[PDB]
């Protein structure tokens, strides 16, 4: 209708934000940015609903206008900024650094990291073009453009990028035997190995993923994010290491650890 929309309603927000049904008619409506709004996290959701550092939306802005929150090494001041996958939100007042990375239930995890590993991130390359004046570039999964990459970088590789400079450090190719991170679908937040990749000319190549517990599942190619070699990731990992216990074990782990 006549132009882009500015509102977003509760019961239309992404379910991995875990906003409650009642107590509000609307939802934060992420701004335009590096990450698609279905798979991003607004800063208000991360500092009020996850960290509980705020009780209202009014004092999220009170926090943000003091230039406390840095996303990817730069101070960001809008309330509904689209933070997403491997974003490196750091609160210097608390000296807490975070990396946004997925739960095994598909949610975003409160994953706290150190001062080192808060100075880089990984971005899956979307396309490798040759821009004008003959200068090649890559773009990453968060819309970052890096000029003059290494000529052995092709699509679906991951790339380790510095946050102070924006340059490209060493990278990881895409072949069998590499650790992955699944970023969309039924198996969101699961960690495994490339072992078989099915080419399909005409659309949607599929990858067979094998985790450490000898299970196997299949996702599309565009839900797969390589994060290093087997047993040697390039980032820290959340609780559980993306393992997808069935509901029988999760009943067992809960009741055993409830007490002792």
């Amino acid at each position: 209708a006549r132009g882009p929309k500015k509102h977003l309603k509760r019961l239309a927000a992404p379910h991995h934000w875990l906003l409650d049904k009642l107590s509000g008619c609307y939802a934060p409506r992420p701004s335009a940015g590096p990450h698609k709004l279905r798979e991003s996290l607004p800063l208000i959701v991360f500092l009020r609903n996850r960290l509980k550092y705020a009780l209202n939306g009014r004092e999220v802005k009170a926090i943000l206008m003091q230039r406390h929150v840095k996303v990817d090494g730069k101070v960001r001041t809008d309330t509904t900024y689209p933070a997403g996958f491997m974003d490196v939100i750091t609160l210097d007042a608390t000296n807490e650094n975070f990396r946004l990375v997925y739960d095994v239930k598909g949610r975003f995890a409160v994953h706290r990291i150190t001062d080192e590993e808060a100075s880089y991130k990984l971005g899956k390359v979307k396309k490798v073009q040759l821009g004008k004046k003959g200068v090649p570039y890559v773009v990453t999964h968060d819309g970052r453009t890096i000029r003059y990459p290494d000529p052995n970088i092709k699509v679906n590789d991951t790339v380790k990028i510095d946050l102070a400079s924006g340059k490209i450090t060493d990278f990881i190719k895409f072949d069998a035997g590499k650790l992955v991170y699944v970023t969309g679908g039924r198996n969101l937040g699961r960690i495994g190995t490339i072992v078989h990749k099915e080419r399909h000319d005409g659309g949607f190549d599929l990858v067979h993923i094998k985790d450490s517990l000898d299970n196997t599942f299949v996702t599309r190619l565009n839900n797969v994010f390589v994060i290093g070699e087997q047993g040697k990731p390039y980032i820290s990992l959340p609780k559980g290491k993306g393992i997808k216990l069935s509901i029988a074990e999760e009943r067992d782990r809960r009741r055993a650890q409830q007490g002792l």
């Binding site: 550092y53 009780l55 009014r58 004092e59 009170a62 003091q66 007042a93």
Partner: protein
């Protein structure tokens, strides 16, 4: 009225808002209710916050009586308890003054009236007064 016990649960320090925030759990086994003002007195003693760096707002007496639970804030350096508190919660404690203004009906009716003129308005008042005078 034998005793009241202040139990502060779920204490989270908030450096980037310059405050400490927690769940107040008061156990008043014979009192009727516990009346937030002397909670602000008693919470000041256990945190050294001179009754102006503290705020309690959300209390609910449990069914059957004898227990009430609410939220509580304790600030650093009272000058920062006016920087970050909402104005409505300062005027409960007397730190801020209740600002006086007309109702929304008059505040909107005035804007629509003032939207009709263009400019200062005192160029037209000069030329309409002389027609009213003569």
């Amino acid at each position: 009225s034998d005793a009241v016990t202040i139990r502060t649960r779920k204490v989270i320090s908030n450096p980037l808002l310059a405050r400490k925030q927690f769940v107040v759990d008061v156990l008043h086994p014979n009192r009727a209710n516990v009346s937030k003002d002397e909670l602000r007195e008693k919470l000041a003693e256990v945190y050294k916050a001179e009754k102006d760096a503290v705020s309690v707002f959300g209390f609910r007496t449990q069914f059957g009586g004898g227990k009430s639970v609410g939220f509580g804030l304790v600030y650093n350096s009272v000058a920062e308890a006016k920087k970050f508190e909402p104005t409505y919660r300062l005027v409960r404690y007397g730190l801020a003054e209740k600002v006086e203004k007309a109702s929304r009906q008059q505040r909107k009716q005035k804007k629509n009236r003032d939207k009709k003129i263009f400019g200062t308005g005192k160029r037209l008042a000069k030329k309409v007064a002389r027609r009213n005078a003569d």
